[PDB]
Amino acid sequence: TTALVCDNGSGLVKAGFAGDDAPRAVFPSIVGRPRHQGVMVGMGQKDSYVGDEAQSKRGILTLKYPIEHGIITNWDDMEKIWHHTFYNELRVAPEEHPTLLTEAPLNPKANREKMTQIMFETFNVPAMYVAIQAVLSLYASGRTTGIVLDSGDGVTHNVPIYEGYALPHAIMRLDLAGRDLTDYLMKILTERGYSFVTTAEREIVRDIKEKLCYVALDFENEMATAASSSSLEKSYELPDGQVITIGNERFRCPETLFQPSFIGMESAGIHETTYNSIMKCDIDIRKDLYANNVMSGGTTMYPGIADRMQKEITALAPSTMKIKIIAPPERKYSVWIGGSILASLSTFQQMWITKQEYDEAGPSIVHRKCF
Amino acid sequence: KILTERGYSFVTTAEREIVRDIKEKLCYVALDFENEMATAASSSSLEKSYELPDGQVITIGNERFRCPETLFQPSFIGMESAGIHETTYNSIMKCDIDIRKDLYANNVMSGGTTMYPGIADRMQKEITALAPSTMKIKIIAPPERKYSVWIGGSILASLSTFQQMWITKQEYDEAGPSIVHRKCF
């Protein structure tokens, strides 16, 4: 009886088996509904397109994200997401397979209750475990101690772990990641004349953010160079054939992760959150956590972000001590890879939430069996 | 209006059939307008003859390609609207962005106004000038496109799925003749 790992992230659902290297099915989490009038009778008109089908036909669809900042809002859409990732992507019966789901920390508990109730009553399993994503990132990193900054599409959270022990008072959560960067990239893309208002255009601005944006090492000098010379400007071809040219927006978009006052949020940047999480830890273990900054998540794919994290923390830390940013090349799927490591662990078989334990304890054992 | 230029007068409704026959048989769409005007002004290789039912013979020159040019240039008959190529292009920009490529590869014409044997290449040139250069302008022009509206009607009525979409006698009897707004497009 092999195991399934299904990271139900805000942006990209990543699912696959246990023990495998790369995640088998990676597809975005969108439910698309038609908004125009179907005139051509027959043809099998779906009322809702889920996944890559909604991605391809996105020009005539209202797209909806069921998960917003790690909290599942629309439960029928998320039921259709689970139905698609089980019965169409992986083509597996969930009644003969355990499932490991991932969850952001500091979540609403009723969300955890509802994934428990749906996952044991709609897609009923032999077993399921809900786990924190940062622990899975530290699993895939292989090291035991370390602070993990995980930044998906909705949640950027810091969790520090020392020698196998998490510190729950030092866990912090920030609702600022790639969806807000997409919205801010639209809002600064209106300066050059390019308008993007629909839900379909979120995909195009997201592709612009994925393909062209990068983290500046120094923001002010990059501002001066992009204002002075047109060397940093890059051209991108739209799906209709038009060509946009973006300059400073390549590095004004990710700088919201280091300066959240751009979109008006009061809280400080991710480097200050990492440093404050380390100062919230005990004084002996900060030597291990400075040397083992593990990033994960698809938001850290920008090709300047490790040097910026090193520079900001080395600015913040005392200068008598080394800072080392662990940035593996496959850190997008490191939540999935550590989930596959955990599901292949022989010790992990004893803390599965059984259906028997769910029936005997209600949907309430998930607060006590999990973290 | 422009057949009176050479000397031929047609004012009655019976003569409209003759002028329509001349338009059907002899007219064609110029690929380039000004080069064809200069060619017809230079030499009479483009002039063609047609025999009237009484027995007179007309010969027309530039009027072969001035008459279908009004579709691409409506200011000849004094209408403020744009030509059919700009109408097609503006209908593409009024759509959403992500589908526009499929609108470029599937330009479909129908009706007997596109029977002129230069109109597909001209519309390809006009849209290719209008569209960005990285894109494919494929215009479908079947030989049967004079009757394709009826052919698609026979296509739609041969469906099994369309038999529930009719407006029956009984539904008209409750709803009055107003159900055709809510049932049809």
Binding site: G42, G44 | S154, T161
Partner: peptide
């Protein structure tokens, strides 16, 4: 736990109508 371990389509429709005439 020891006892439990011991236990373990526009195109198709339109071409169909075309060949129907």
């Amino acid at each position: 736990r020891k006892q439990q371990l011991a236990e373990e389509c526009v195109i198709d429709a339109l071409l169909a109508d075309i060949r129907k005439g």
